Design a protein around this ligand. Structure first.
Ligand code: ZN
Length: 7
């Protein structure tokens, strides 16, 4: 699975 963190 691809991940994205929008800190
Ligand atoms: Zn993954």
């Amino acid at each position: 699975g691809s991940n994205q963190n929008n800190f």
